[PDB]
Amino acid sequence: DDDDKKTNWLKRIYRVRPCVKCKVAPRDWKVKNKHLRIFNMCKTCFNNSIDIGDDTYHGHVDWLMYADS
Amino acid sequence: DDDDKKTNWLKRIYRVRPCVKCKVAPRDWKVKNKHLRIFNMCKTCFNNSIDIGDDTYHGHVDWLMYADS
Numbered sequence: 292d293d294d295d296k297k298t299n300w301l302k303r304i305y306r307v308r309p310c311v312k313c314k315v316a317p318r319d320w321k322v323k324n325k326h327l328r329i330f331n332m333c334k335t336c337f338n339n340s341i342d343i344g345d346d347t348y349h350g351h352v353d354w355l356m357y358a359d360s
Numbered sequence: 361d362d363d364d365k366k367t368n369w370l371k372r373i374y375r376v377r378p379c380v381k382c383k384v385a386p387r388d389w390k391v392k393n394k395h396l397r398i399f400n401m402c403k404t405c406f407n408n409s410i411d412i413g414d415d416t417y418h419g420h421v422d423w424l425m426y427a428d429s
């Protein structure tokens with residue numbers, strides 16, 4: 292089933308690329324109607340970046356949650 | 361840059377999962393406005409499936425080509 296190919300992919304994408312900053316915690320993320328937005332950092336590193344004044348790692352990547360658009 | 365994260369991902373997704381049927385040739389694919397549709401089979405196995413009467417591997421998965429939706 293094609294939606295499952297998509298879901299296993301998103302499951303893998305999320306598991307193997309941790310927070311770009313601490314390199315260990317997994318990323319923050321939210322559901323965005325029909326997309327999964329994976330943020331670049333976990334919530335702790337993100338809050339921290341604001342406090343330290345660094346916006347270098349700010350961002351996200353959206354993923355369609357279904358096989359067909 | 362976030363679009364590059366998306367592009368490298370799509371580049372990897374395409375490289376490491378070959379045709380579901382011959383398991384060696386890479387998949388057929390087309391650009392679909394703002395999505396990349398990766399088909400399940402290469403063109404040769406797909407044409408062949410029609411000739412043999414097998415629709416088991418027919419399908420695709422669409423991928424947003426950008427980081428933001």
Ligand SMILES: Nc1ncnc2c1ncn2[C@@H]1O[C@H](COP(=O)(O)OP(=O)(O)OP(=O)(O)O)[C@@H](O)[C@H]1O
Pocket residue numbers: 319328330331332333334337348349350351
């Ligand atoms: N955990 C995080 N890691 C990296 N960047 C983040 C994280 N959380 C938010 N950002 C980024 O901070 C910038 C401003 O964040 P913002 O919360 O506006 O994103 P958003 O998903 O649009 O939320 P909202 O819809 O509430 O504005 C955006 O680029 C967002 O990608």
Ligand SMILES: Nc1ncnc2c1ncn2[C@@H]1O[C@H](COP(=O)(O)OP(=O)(O)OP(=O)(O)O)[C@@H](O)[C@H]1O
Pocket residue numbers: 388397399400401402403406417418419420
């Ligand atoms: N190379 C392929 N491997 C697997 N399935 C395919 C392949 N090519 C087409 N199909 C599938 O065959 C079914 C009918 O194909 P079709 O060509 O209608 O797809 P399509 O991208 O909608 O093309 P069109 O817009 O011309 O109809 C669809 O499920 C499509 O996913």
Ligand SMILES: [Cl-]
Pocket residue numbers: 353354355356422423424
């Ligand atoms: Cl996607």
Ligand SMILES: [Zn+2]
Pocket residue numbers: 310311312313314315316332333335336337
């Ligand atoms: Zn972190």
Ligand SMILES: [Zn+2]
Pocket residue numbers: 379380381382383384385401402404405406
């Ligand atoms: Zn094949």
